[PDB]
Paper text:
We previously characterized the APR of the Tc5b miniprotein – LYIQWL –, and found that it is able to form polymorphic amyloid crystal structures with both parallel and antiparallel β-sheets. To study the potential interference of TFA, we have lyophilized the peptide in HCl, and crystallized it again from 10 v/v% ethanol. Interestingly, crystals grown at 37 °C (in the absence of TFA) consisted of parallel β-sheets. In this case a simple temperature change lead to an anti-parallel/parallel switch: starting solutions of completely identical chemical composition resulted in amyloid-like crystalline phases of entirely different topology. On the other hand, in crystals from the present work, grown from a solution containing less ethanol and no residual TFA, neighbouring β-sheets run parallel to each other, resulting in two larger class 4 and two smaller class 1 interfaces leading to an overall class 4 topology. The hydrophobic residues (Leu1, Ile3, Trp5) form clusters in both structures, while hydrogen bonds are formed by chain termini, solvent molecules, Tyr2, Gln4 and Trp5 of chain A in the class 4 structure. A common structural feature in the two parallel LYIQWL structures is the presence of a weak Tyr – Tyr interaction. The geometric parameters characterising this interaction are similar in the two structures: the distance between the centres of the aromatic rings are 5.6 Å and 6.1 Å in the class 1 and class 4 structures, respectively, while the angle between the planes of the rings are 81.9° and 86.7°. In contrast to the class 1 structure, the class 4 structure did not contain ethanol molecules – only a water molecule could be identified in the electron density map. This suggests that the presence of an increased amount of ethanol is able to induce an anti-parallel to parallel reorientation of β-sheets, even without forming direct ethanol-peptide contacts within the amyloid nanostructure.
Aggregation-prone-motifs (APRs) of proteins are short segments, which – as isolated peptides - form diverse amyloid-like crystals. We introduce two APRs - designed variants of the incretin mimetic Exendin-4 - that both display crystal-phase polymorphism. Crystallographic and spectroscopic analysis revealed that a single amino-acid substitution can greatly reduce topological variability: while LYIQWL can form both parallel and anti-parallel β-sheets, LYIQNL selects only the former. We found that a simple change in crystallization temperature or modest changes of chemical composition of the solvent system (therefore the available interaction partners) can prompt formation of significantly different nanostructures: we identified four different polymorphs of the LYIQWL and two of the LYIQNL APR peptides.
Residue numbers in the entry:
A (entry chain A), B (entry chain A), C (entry chain A), D (entry chain A), E (entry chain A), F (entry chain B), ...: 1 to 6
The structure:
Amino acid sequence: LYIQWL
Amino acid sequence: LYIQWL
Amino acid sequence: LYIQWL
Amino acid sequence: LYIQWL
Amino acid sequence: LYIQWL
Amino acid sequence: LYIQWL
Amino acid sequence: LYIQWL
Amino acid sequence: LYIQWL
Amino acid sequence: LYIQWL
Amino acid sequence: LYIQWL
């Protein structure tokens, strides 16, 4: 699981 | 699962 | 599952 | 599943 | 399943 | 671009 | 770009 | 870019 | 970039 | 960048 959130 | 969210 | 959301 | 959403 | 939505 | 090979 | 190989 | 190999 | 190898 | 090898 990879989450990139901005 | 890959989530890229901006 | 790949989600790209802007 | 691939979702590209803008 | 591929969804491209703008 | 979405590539699925079975 | 999403690549899935089975 | 998401790469999954089985 | 996410790389998963099985 | 996330790399997972099995």
